[PDB]
Amino acid sequence: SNIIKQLEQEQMKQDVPSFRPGDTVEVKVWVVEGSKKRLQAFEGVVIAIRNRGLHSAFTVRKISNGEGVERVFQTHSPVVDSISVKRRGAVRKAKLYYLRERTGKAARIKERLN
Amino acid sequence: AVQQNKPTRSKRGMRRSHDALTAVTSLSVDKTSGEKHLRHHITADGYYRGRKVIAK
Amino acid sequence: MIGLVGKKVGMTRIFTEDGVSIPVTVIEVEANRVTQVKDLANDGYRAIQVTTGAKKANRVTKPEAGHFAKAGVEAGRGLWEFRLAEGEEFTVGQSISVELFADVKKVDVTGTSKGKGFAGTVKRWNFRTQDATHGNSLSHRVPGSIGQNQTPGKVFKGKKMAGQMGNERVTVQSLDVVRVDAERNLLLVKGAVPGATGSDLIVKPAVKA
Amino acid sequence: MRHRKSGRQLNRNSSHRQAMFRNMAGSLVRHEIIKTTLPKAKELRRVVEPLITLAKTDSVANRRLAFARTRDNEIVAKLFNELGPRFASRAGGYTRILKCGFRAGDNAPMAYIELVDRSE
Amino acid sequence: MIQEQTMLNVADNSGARRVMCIKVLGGSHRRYAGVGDIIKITIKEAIPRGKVKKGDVLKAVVVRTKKGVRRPDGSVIRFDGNACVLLNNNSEQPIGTRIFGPVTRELRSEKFMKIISLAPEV
Amino acid sequence: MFKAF
RNA sequence: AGGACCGAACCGACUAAUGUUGAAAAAUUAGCGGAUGACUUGUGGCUGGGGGUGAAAGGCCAAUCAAACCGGGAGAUAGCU
RNA sequence: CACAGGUGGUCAGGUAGAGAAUACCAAGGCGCUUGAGAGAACUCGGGUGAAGGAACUAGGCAAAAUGGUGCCGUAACUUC
RNA sequence: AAUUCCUUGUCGGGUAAGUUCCGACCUGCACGAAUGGCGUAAUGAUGGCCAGGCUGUCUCCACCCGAGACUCAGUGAAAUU
RNA sequence: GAUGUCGGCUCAUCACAUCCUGGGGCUGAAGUAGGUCCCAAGGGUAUGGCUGUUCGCCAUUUAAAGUGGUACGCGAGCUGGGUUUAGAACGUCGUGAGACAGUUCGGUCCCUAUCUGCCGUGGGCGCUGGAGAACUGAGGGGGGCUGCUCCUAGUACGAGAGGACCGGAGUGGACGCAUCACUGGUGUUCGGGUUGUCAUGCCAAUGGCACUGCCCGGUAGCUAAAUGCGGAAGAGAUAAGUGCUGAAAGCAUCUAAGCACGAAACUUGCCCCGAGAUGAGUUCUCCCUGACCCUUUAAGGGUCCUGAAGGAACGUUGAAGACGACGACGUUGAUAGGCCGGGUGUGUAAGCGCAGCGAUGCGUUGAGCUAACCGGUACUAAUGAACCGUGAGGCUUAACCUU
Ligand SMILES: [Mg+2]
Ligand SMILES: [Mg+2]
Ligand SMILES: [Mg+2]
Ligand SMILES: [Mg+2]
Ligand SMILES: [Mg+2]
Ligand SMILES: [Mg+2]
Ligand SMILES: [Mg+2]
Ligand SMILES: [Mg+2]
Ligand SMILES: [Mg+2]
Ligand SMILES: [Mg+2]
Ligand SMILES: [Mg+2]
Ligand SMILES: [Mg+2]
Ligand SMILES: [Mg+2]
Ligand SMILES: [Mg+2]
Ligand SMILES: [Mg+2]
Ligand SMILES: [Mg+2]
Ligand SMILES: [Mg+2]
Ligand SMILES: [Mg+2]
Ligand SMILES: [Mg+2]
Ligand SMILES: [Mg+2]
Ligand SMILES: [Mg+2]
Ligand SMILES: [Mg+2]
Ligand SMILES: [Mg+2]
Ligand SMILES: [Mg+2]
Ligand SMILES: [Mg+2]
Ligand SMILES: [Mg+2]
Ligand SMILES: [Mg+2]
Ligand SMILES: [Mg+2]
Ligand SMILES: [Mg+2]
Ligand SMILES: [Mg+2]
Ligand SMILES: [Mg+2]
Ligand SMILES: [Mg+2]
Ligand SMILES: [Mg+2]
Ligand SMILES: [Mg+2]
């Protein structure tokens, strides 16, 4: 699969930062409003990350206007511009799917002060 | 579920035409010990490919 | 129009500046050496016999190697034929590469499907499964009735039944050509194609047009 | 379907299958040569050989890991004291399978499995 | 994936709390209604003194689903619950005057520009 | 088993 | 105190599946009812066929019951096959 | 029948537990008299499941679910 | 109505839609007072109906773990004809 | 001396007196939308509430929710709710035993497939020397549905309301095919958390059992809900039908001679099987160039020499597979395992120190472990051979190469 590796390698984003499950991440995504392009910020807690090279993706959960929302971002897609870690959280599990059943105080994540 | 007529000897024989066994095509000879054996199997005295694989 | 024989390297994702992701099957098309030309005067039809790849010299039968020697070509994986229309001609030993598809918008891909072995009617023919409860006795996913009593007194030919599924030639039509990379002998086609990774693959111009 | 899957079930559940190879693996370490059915010998390769690789480097953590996979201190001592040093230079392939006909009781195919350095 | 017998929350102030889908319009044997699809619904719970009452048969457009919405780049947007906006049966126009919760871009059509304008997010 | 009346 | 309550042994047999040339001529598996009482159980005894016994289903009376089983009248009779 | 049935008493260990339930063990006794491979349909006994949640069906059949201690609290109807 | 033929009677409730269910009407084919009438707390492996929870019951099946099925060695049936 | 019922489920197949889609004639057909008749069977031709129901009514959809035959198709395929055993009760009839196309509650659905048929998959032989490949395509099968929006055009039409045909574009429903790149499911062969108990002497650390003990995540593979594609244009001959020229019949007349158009039907076009197509085809390569002996002297038998092409067998095995089969490889070798490196998944191992009375926390440390995956590596196993298969391939005639 060296052919696939070269094809995927040539189009992998290079400025991807380092982030982990449980850290609050803000992602800038291109949104097209007619002819004019625009950027909107989606900020939330990273509850799941899959690393597959070009096919890597991560899931961000946020509560917006009283409704829970989950977005699965393709990290290397051109749609996403930059990733910023506003806060670093310490968790014991790779996947935080249990957060879906909690809200408010029960959903708090302790900060990772390494 | 069960037959309506007794099948004949002929039908019985034809069904058994494919039940015949096949003999081993040939038997390999150990390079040094000299006993005939199945290919890729050790000989009676434990030899294989000219080396005494098994002590017994 | 003449096609080419390639190998299913795998599947990949191609990103576009507009933000759209195109799933592309990567097909490697090495040099296609023509081994024989079929003529009306001798064979009754116009076609070209081609071979691709290489195979170990210890396993090329001189009946096959002699065929390659006749055309002065190195033995390939196998032999395939393509029909010739009125306007195209070729010479024995000519090497054809992936640029032939550089001017082709759509291609036709054929290959052997993945073998599912002995498949039941539910999997093979999308038969509806019967009740899993409510008294059903050993007939949860059985085919059911297969006839209409005495009047026909038989099962009609072509009745859908359990049997071998897959492992057969299949053609997928009207696949967009995303990109042609003649510097690495690769062809990218949108969508999936029959067969597993590394299987022989035949690519032809879209007949449907 | 069985596409690209590995590991023979051998008509046993996971618990029984795991236990059998733990005992058989210890037997091969204790006795440099054993007799068993051909399919079992092939499956055993994926159990005993990794243990020998673990014994290549001697450490408290590795010994405890070996103990968890054999549950026999005598085998663990054999792995790290004798087998490890002997196979220090070999890059895998610490076991060899030899076919020895068929079992009289049920005609099962039998094959000897042994360490490659049994020569003495 | 919205079918018959599925319960949906109401994302508008028409007065209904949760409605019951009774038909997936737009085809024969059609069984699924994603975001932006119109469905026939019956109101099950509603607030008093609202402009709609329990037992009314209307149609609504799905604005949020647990199964989520797929984007061209492969990204998927999921919501914690299914929601819909009630529409007038004859004119297929929104009945409520305010939308609750985030809305998805797939309803960016001339027939649903009213919902997008009134939506709080995107 | 069966009956016919 | 209780023909009281929950629940094992014990005695029952409501549902489902399996089995239906069964492991079994009535069972197994998972649930289920009673479980100090009109309870259950060991040993022995008594009631005999137009009779017994029956909280009553024509149930049961040795895998047999709108009249048990065995022998006899008997080679009943059969305008039927 | 070397049959997944039936058959009355006596003895009653350890940890957890209200317990002779249940789990793992002691003493003690066993692995049930065809095996070896393969890992198709289908059947049997089980595990998990995206979104929906009785739309199944004669019928929520079957499955899933509830499940223990204390403490708070508990309606109509009651022969109290 | 365990009783009603006509009959899915008529009206109301429940459902988006109810030959069933609940309430009422009385035109009771063919209720009725110890072969008992009408009520009735509690009880029921009892009949009908509804709701919450719950789910592969289903939309629509997918995967997996075991015992058969399949192959090899040994033993070796049956109904039927 | 036995042909098992209503309905449901599953799976269907045919007819055309056609429900939708297609082509037309009339219309009391302005348009839109209808009415009626003709041709057309290629495809398609609802989910629910009540009831055992078919049916029917009702709710809401659809381009339409066609009518029938097939033992009122289909119980050695399922179900057993209804009828139609034994129990019991109501009303009713009878003095009574009992009885009721009256109503109520409860109530055993057996069969391991011999043959035909059908769905798959092999063996044998044949195709006239043998062998390895690629093909021609006689034949056969699969596929054939359709909505909505936009443009043409608010144009034709109409007083207005309303509102096109004919042609284009886009996006859907259902169905079918393929595949795992993505989103997910599963993942009892990968990590981790945790309850009870037992054991490894003990602490520590681990293992067994308890549905995988209960759980949280998960690689490969499989897979749909996931995402790619498909139905067609085009051609030929036509149905109903509309026409050209044109007589029989000075006219007329689509017809008798001669021409043209005409539909999802038909033959092709697209996809798949296919020379057992015994009518057994074609093309391109490869292999064999010896002695004799007998009489029943002929497509004769037999001995010696010879054993080619190739195949089979065995072994390592496969995203091939029930078994056969099929594909890869066998040292002149990456076929499988292991090994090395990497990637995934889990989430900071063990040991030791540092803080705390302690549970525990922190440091070493994104550590340790890591299945099927990726790129490599002969460390292990794929043996030197034997086995099968031969030695120039009938006759007649013809056309050539000839003497
Ligand atoms: Mg396969
Ligand atoms: Mg049964
Ligand atoms: Mg079953
Ligand atoms: Mg016939
Ligand atoms: Mg077995
Ligand atoms: Mg276990
Ligand atoms: Mg009591
Ligand atoms: Mg009790
Ligand atoms: Mg029981
Ligand atoms: Mg009686
Ligand atoms: Mg008896
Ligand atoms: Mg007499
Ligand atoms: Mg007599
Ligand atoms: Mg026994
Ligand atoms: Mg116990
Ligand atoms: Mg299995
Ligand atoms: Mg689910
Ligand atoms: Mg239904
Ligand atoms: Mg139940
Ligand atoms: Mg349960
Ligand atoms: Mg009433
Ligand atoms: Mg009375
Ligand atoms: Mg009682
Ligand atoms: Mg056998
Ligand atoms: Mg008869
Ligand atoms: Mg046609
Ligand atoms: Mg209906
Ligand atoms: Mg209901
Ligand atoms: Mg019938
Ligand atoms: Mg039936
Ligand atoms: Mg039948
Ligand atoms: Mg019944
Ligand atoms: Mg009568
Ligand atoms: Mg300890």
Side-chain angles (χ1 to χ4, degrees):
Chain A
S1 301
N2 290 324
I3 286 77
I4 313 284
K5 177 182 270 53
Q6 207 318 294
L7 286 166
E8 287 175 345
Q9 177 30 65
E10 166 280 5
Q11 59 183 316
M12 272 195 346
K13 203 193 297 289
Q14 300 321 45
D15 65 320
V16 184
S18 77
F19 58 95
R20 274 161 59 162
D23 323 282
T24 289
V25 161
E26 178 206 38
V27 177
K28 291 312 183 24
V29 281
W30 282 115
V31 304
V32 284
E33 170 60 359
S35 58
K36 55 182 174 183
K37 254 166 100 73
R38 187 172 71 81
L39 284 193
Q40 86 174 351
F42 192 86
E43 182 181 316
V45 176
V46 179
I47 62 168
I49 308 176
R50 76 183 306 245
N51 319 284
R52 293 299 206 297
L54 193 274
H55 314 299
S56 303
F58 62 102
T59 298
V60 184
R61 166 168 261 269
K62 86 176 283 143
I63 287 68
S64 194
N65 327 81
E67 312 309 340
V69 191
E70 284 203 20
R71 279 200 67 154
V72 187
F73 293 101
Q74 315 285 330
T75 182
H76 295 295
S77 100
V79 178
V80 316
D81 325 285
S82 70
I83 295 151
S84 34
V85 178
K86 316 326 217 73
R87 184 168 174 263
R88 315 218 317 296
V91 278
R92 298 289 299 284
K93 283 206 252 72
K95 304 292 192 293
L96 310 193
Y97 297 133
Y98 72 88
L99 283 178
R100 298 174 173 151
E101 303 142 13
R102 313 188 189 199
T103 79
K105 295 280 187 179
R108 289 179 297 174
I109 311 267
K110 68 186 331 295
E111 178 161 26
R112 191 170 101 262
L113 321 154
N114 64 295
Chain B
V2 72
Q3 72 196 4
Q4 280 210 344
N5 270 115
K6 171 184 203 188
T8 77
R9 305 176 254 291
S10 190
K11 259 214 64 53
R12 184 182 67 215
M14 303 168 161
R15 184 178 61 246
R16 292 178 187 175
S17 70
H18 296 291
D19 292 354
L21 308 175
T22 165
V24 278
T25 88
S26 212
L27 292 191
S28 326
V29 176
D30 204 282
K31 41 198 298 323
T32 180
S33 72
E35 322 77 272
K36 289 214 315 322
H37 68 108
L38 217 57
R39 201 157 185 77
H40 306 107
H41 289 31
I42 68 200
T43 77
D45 325 312
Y47 279 93
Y48 186 58
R49 297 273 287 287
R51 172 193 92 131
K52 173 146 217 153
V53 153
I54 292 319
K56 294 195 291 291
Chain C
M1 154 209 195
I2 291 301
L4 297 173
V5 187
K7 205 176 51 59
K8 184 170 176 178
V9 158
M11 270 210 66
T12 310
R13 191 218 303 245
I14 273 281
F15 282 114
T16 48
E17 307 101 290
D18 57 2
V20 155
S21 165
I22 299 313
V24 304
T25 312
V26 180
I27 308 163
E28 102 174 347
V29 186
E30 289 278 311
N32 266 184
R33 293 92 68 186
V34 178
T35 302
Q36 190 194 115
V37 299
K38 297 292 184 78
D39 298 329
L40 300 181
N42 192 357
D43 312 0
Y45 66 107
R46 298 190 71 251
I48 50 138
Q49 193 193 70
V50 55
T51 195
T52 181
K55 75 186 288 180
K56 300 170 66 160
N58 273 43
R59 298 201 118 160
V60 278
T61 63
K62 47 230 289 183
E64 293 164 41
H67 193 78
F68 292 115
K70 183 76 189 297
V73 174
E74 297 336 321
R77 269 202 308 281
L79 293 206
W80 300 268
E81 259 188 25
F82 296 90
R83 304 301 277 296
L84 291 165
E86 303 304 329
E88 329 86 288
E89 63 60 49
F90 291 86
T91 305
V92 296
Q94 179 176 357
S95 147
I96 307 164
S97 100
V98 72
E99 37 251 65
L100 185 71
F101 292 118
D103 220 52
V104 175
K105 315 326 101 193
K106 285 206 173 5
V107 289
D108 261 353
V109 183
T110 89
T112 301
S113 207
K114 283 183 137 172
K116 315 297 175 74
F118 205 106
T121 57
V122 173
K123 180 179 181 63
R124 195 177 181 213
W125 301 111
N126 314 320
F127 276 23
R128 291 201 245 241
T129 309
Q130 304 180 47
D131 291 283
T133 77
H134 291 291
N136 186 298
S137 305
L138 322 180
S139 324
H140 304 294
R141 51 194 295 142
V142 302
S145 192
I146 65 178
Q148 303 82 20
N149 214 331
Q150 174 171 190
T151 281
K154 70 177 178 178
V155 182
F156 299 131
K157 261 253 162 211
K159 186 76 187 74
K160 290 174 183 174
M161 299 197 155
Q164 174 63 38
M165 173 186 204
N167 191 35
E168 54 158 312
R169 180 215 205 74
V170 200
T171 296
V172 182
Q173 297 198 101
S174 284
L175 297 171
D176 306 19
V177 173
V178 176
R179 175 154 51 88
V180 165
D181 168 359
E183 316 56 26
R184 307 208 276 268
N185 310 26
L186 301 148
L187 168 54
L188 277 60
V189 300
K190 180 177 174 180
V193 309
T197 296
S199 61
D200 282 319
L201 205 71
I202 300 196
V203 188
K204 296 199 275 92
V207 75
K208 191 68 63 160
Chain D
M1 257 158 298
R2 201 212 64 73
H3 294 170
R4 288 313 202 67
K5 308 207 172 203
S6 75
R8 292 172 179 79
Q9 180 221 37
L10 298 170
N11 296 288
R12 293 171 174 72
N13 50 22
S14 200
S15 315
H16 186 186
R17 189 162 53 251
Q18 183 195 312
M20 188 217 312
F21 290 125
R22 170 170 304 155
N23 300 325
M24 198 167 353
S27 307
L28 179 56
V29 173
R30 201 200 303 293
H31 319 287
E32 310 307 39
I33 180 145
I34 61 170
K35 183 135 155 263
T36 191
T37 65
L38 184 38
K40 261 174 199 103
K42 280 171 189 321
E43 205 68 350
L44 189 63
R45 279 183 314 199
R46 321 196 43 227
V47 176
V48 53
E49 301 209 38
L51 270 277
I52 292 188
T53 298
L54 186 37
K56 288 281 238 290
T57 165
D58 189 344
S59 74
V60 173
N62 288 350
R63 284 187 183 248
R64 286 180 179 200
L65 262 284
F67 182 68
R69 294 170 192 198
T70 61
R71 298 299 303 186
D72 214 348
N73 282 298
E74 204 222 36
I75 301 303
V76 175
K78 191 104 142 52
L79 275 172
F80 285 75
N81 302 339
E82 311 316 15
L83 298 188
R86 286 203 321 222
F87 294 126
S89 59
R90 284 198 181 266
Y94 320 110
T95 66
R96 148 167 47 243
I97 297 173
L98 296 145
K99 299 167 187 69
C100 44
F102 299 84
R103 184 147 71 183
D106 52 354
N107 200 54
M110 305 300 270
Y112 289 102
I113 185 161
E114 61 158 30
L115 312 184
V116 317
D117 87 339
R118 270 186 63 248
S119 186
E120 183 62 33
Chain E
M1 275 150 84
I2 307 311
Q3 322 180 15
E4 297 186 29
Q5 310 293 308
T6 192
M7 224 72 105
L8 293 114
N9 303 282
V10 180
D12 80 50
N13 71 320
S14 58
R17 258 84 84 66
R18 64 193 307 72
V19 304
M20 165 76 149
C21 176
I22 65 173
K23 190 63 66 187
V24 177
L25 307 176
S28 147
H29 295 110
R30 187 181 191 187
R31 49 189 153 254
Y32 297 141
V35 178
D37 293 350
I38 301 208
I39 52 168
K40 201 84 181 199
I41 57 100
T42 179
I43 304 183
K44 293 299 198 184
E45 303 73 329
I47 66 131
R49 305 169 261 300
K51 323 175 136 193
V52 299
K53 53 169 28 53
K54 177 206 244 293
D56 279 351
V57 171
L58 302 170
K59 38 171 62 165
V61 56
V62 179
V63 302
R64 293 190 291 274
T65 68
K66 295 223 39 162
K67 169 62 82 213
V69 197
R70 209 86 196 274
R71 292 300 178 96
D73 70 356
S75 297
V76 49
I77 296 208
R78 296 192 293 253
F79 304 88
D80 64 359
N82 314 299
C84 66
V85 174
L86 312 188
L87 312 174
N88 166 248
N89 222 320
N90 277 302
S91 67
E92 301 183 48
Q93 288 304 343
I95 297 180
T97 36
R98 284 177 11 91
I99 308 330
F100 301 121
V103 167
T104 279
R105 179 161 290 101
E106 271 67 355
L107 318 98
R108 256 257 190 171
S109 325
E110 46 294 358
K111 183 158 37 33
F112 298 128
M113 222 40 40
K114 179 63 138 317
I115 293 152
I116 291 270
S117 46
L118 291 199
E121 208 155 41
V122 317
Chain F
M1 306 202 84
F2 319 119
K3 303 172 186 70
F5 311 155

